[PDB]
Amino acid sequence: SLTAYQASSQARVDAAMHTLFTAPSPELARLYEAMRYSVMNGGKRVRPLLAYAACEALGGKPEQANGAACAVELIHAYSLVHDDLPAMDDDDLRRGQPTTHKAFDEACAILAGDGLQSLAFSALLDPALSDASAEIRLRMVTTLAQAAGPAGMVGGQAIDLGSVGLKLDQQALEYMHRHKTGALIEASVILGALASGRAEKGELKALQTYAQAIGLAFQVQDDILDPTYPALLGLAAAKEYALELRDQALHALRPFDAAAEPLRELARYIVE
Amino acid sequence: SLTAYQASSQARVDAAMHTLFTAPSPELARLYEAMRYSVMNGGKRVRPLLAYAACEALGGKPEQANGAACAVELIHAYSLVHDDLPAMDDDDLRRGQPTTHKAFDEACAILAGDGLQSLAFSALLDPALSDASAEIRLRMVTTLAQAAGPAGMVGGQAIDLGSVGLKLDQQALEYMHRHKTGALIEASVILGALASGRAEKGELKALQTYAQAIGLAFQVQDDILDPTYPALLGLAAAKEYALELRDQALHALRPFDAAAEPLRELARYIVE
Known part of the structure; x- marks a missing residue:
C-alpha cells in the first residue's frame, strides 16, 4: 500500500x-x-x-x-x-x-504559470527548504532547467502539438512521452537523490533507469484506464507492457536496501 | 556616444x-x-x-x-x-x-516563452558562457529568479493589468515600473557585477542605486517621447525628472574609475 x-x-x-x-x-x-x-x-x-x-x-x-x-x-x-x-x-x-x-x-x-516557474527555481535554492553543498545544488538547478525546458517538458508539449495530423508509431509516441512527462519524473528522482548529499554515480544511474520506466508505465497505464498504447499494441499487449515497465523499474532498485521500499511501492501502485 | x-x-x-x-x-x-x-x-x-x-x-x-x-x-x-x-x-x-x-x-x-525562461537559467550556469565561483553563481540564479518572478517582473506585469480601472499616483506608478522593468534592469547590472568575481558589498550597493535610477529614467523618458509621467507631473516637470534620474545614476558611479564609463554613457544616452 x-x-x-x-x-x-x-x-x-x-x-x-x-x-x-x-x-x-x-x-x-x-x-x-x-x-x-x-x-x-x-x-x-x-x-x-x-x-x-x-x-x-x-x-x-x-x-x-x-x-x-x-x-x-x-x-x-x-x-x-x-x-x-x-x-x-x-x-x-x-x-x-x-x-x-x-x-x-x-x-x-x-x-x-510564468511566476510559478520562477518560484520553482527560487524554491530549489531556498535555505529554509534544504541544505546541500554548492556543487550538488549546481547539479540540482542545471537538472531542473534541462528537464523543464525546451529539450524536456516544454519540448514534449511542443511535440504533442506537432503530432496533430501525423500518425505516430511506438518509437515516436515514446519519444514524445519521455519529453512531455518523463523528463520531470526523472528530475524528481534525481533531485531527491542529490538532496541527500550522498548520491554516487552508480546509484544515480540505477535511479535514472527506475525513473524512465515508471515515467512510461504511468502513460501506458493511463491509456489502459482510458495515438495510444492500446491502439498501437492491442489492449492485451499494452497491459503486458505496463507490467513489464513496472518490472524494469523494480529490477533497477535491486541494489538498494529496505529504504527504497517507497520507490518500489510506487512502481507497483501504477498498475494496481 | x-x-x-x-x-x-x-x-x-x-x-x-x-x-x-x-x-x-x-x-x-x-x-x-x-x-x-x-x-x-x-x-x-x-x-x-x-x-x-x-x-x-x-x-x-x-x-x-x-x-x-x-x-x-x-x-x-x-x-x-x-x-x-x-x-x-x-x-x-x-x-x-x-x-x-x-x-x-x-x-x-x-x-x-516558457522554454526561453528555462533556457535563461541554463545559460546562467552554462560552463561555455562563464566561470564564476559556486557561492557567486548561487547569488546569480537566486537574483535572476527573484527579479524575473512574481515579486519582480511577473509581479510588475500583474500590477500593470490590475491598474486598469484604477487612477495611479506617482508612488503607485513608480512601484509598478520598479517591478515591471526595474527588477530585470537591476538584475542585469548585479549579475554582470557578480560575473567579474570581484564584486564587493559597497560596489554592489552603488550599482543597485545606479540601476534603479536608470530603470525609472527609461520609463519617464519613454513617456516623454510618447497613467504617464507627463500627465502626473506636467511635461516640464517630467523632462526635469528624467534629467534628475540620470544625475542620480551618474552620482552613484562617482566612486568608480574610467572602467565605468560605459555605464555613465548609458545613463546619459537615455535622455539624449
Whole structure:
C-alpha cells in the first residue's frame, strides 16, 4: 500500500509550499492567489513523493528534499495552468473545479504559470527548504532547467502539438512521452537523490533507469484506464507492457536496501 | 556616444546565444525556430549591455558575463512573447514584423516563452558562457529568479493589468515600473557585477542605486517621447525628472574609475 507514504509526502510538500504563496504587497495579492489556486487544488503530489522517496532511498531525511519537492511540483503546476489555456488544450475545468483562467482570467493564468516557474527555481535554492553543498545544488538547478525546458517538458508539449495530423508509431509516441512527462519524473528522482548529499554515480544511474520506466508505465497505464498504447499494441499487449515497465523499474532498485521500499511501492501502485 | 559599446554588446551576446537555439532533434525544430524568432529580431540588447558594462566596471573581461547577458536577454525576450498574446496586450506586430503567435500560433508562442525562461537559467550556469565561483553563481540564479518572478517582473506585469480601472499616483506608478522593468534592469547590472568575481558589498550597493535610477529614467523618458509621467507631473516637470534620474545614476558611479564609463554613457544616452 502506498497510502501512508502518499499522505506523508503530500502533507510535507504542502506545508513547505505554504510560505511561498504570501504576496509581498497587497498590489500582488491577486497574482499570488492565482498561483495558490493553481497549486493548492488537492493534488496527489507524485513528483514530491518521488523526490522524498529518492532522498530517503539514499539515507537522507525527507525534509532535505523539500526544495526539490517544491520545485518539481511548482514546475508541474505551471505546466498545467498553461496547458489549460484556450490556445493550448482549452479546458474550462480541471478536477471538477474551474481552471485558473476561468476562475481568474487568461492574462492572470499566463502570468501565474510564468511566476510559478520562477518560484520553482527560487524554491530549489531556498535555505529554509534544504541544505546541500554548492556543487550538488549546481547539479540540482542545471537538472531542473534541462528537464523543464525546451529539450524536456516544454519540448514534449511542443511535440504533442506537432503530432496533430501525423500518425505516430511506438518509437515516436515514446519519444514524445519521455519529453512531455518523463523528463520531470526523472528530475524528481534525481533531485531527491542529490538532496541527500550522498548520491554516487552508480546509484544515480540505477535511479535514472527506475525513473524512465515508471515515467512510461504511468502513460501506458493511463491509456489502459482510458495515438495510444492500446491502439498501437492491442489492449492485451499494452497491459503486458505496463507490467513489464513496472518490472524494469523494480529490477533497477535491486541494489538498494529496505529504504527504497517507497520507490518500489510506487512502481507497483501504477498498475494496481 | 554609446554607439560602439552598444554594437560590441549586441554582437557578443548574439554570438553567445547562437548555440542555444539549435534543436536536439527534428521533432523540436519548430519550437526552437519560434524561440529563435522571438530573440533574433534585431533587438538592441540593453540588458546584455548593462551586464557587460557592470562586469567591466569591476575589472572583469566582458565575456565573463556572457552567461549573465544571455540570461537577462532570454528572460526579456520571453516576457515580450507572452506580453504580445491575445489574452495579454494582444499585438499582431512588434518592430514592424509579426509577433511570435502570429508568425507561428498561440500555443507555439506560449511554449516558446516558457522554454526561453528555462533556457535563461541554463545559460546562467552554462560552463561555455562563464566561470564564476559556486557561492557567486548561487547569488546569480537566486537574483535572476527573484527579479524575473512574481515579486519582480511577473509581479510588475500583474500590477500593470490590475491598474486598469484604477487612477495611479506617482508612488503607485513608480512601484509598478520598479517591478515591471526595474527588477530585470537591476538584475542585469548585479549579475554582470557578480560575473567579474570581484564584486564587493559597497560596489554592489552603488550599482543597485545606479540601476534603479536608470530603470525609472527609461520609463519617464519613454513617456516623454510618447497613467504617464507627463500627465502626473506636467511635461516640464517630467523632462526635469528624467534629467534628475540620470544625475542620480551618474552620482552613484562617482566612486568608480574610467572602467565605468560605459555605464555613465548609458545613463546619459537615455535622455539624449
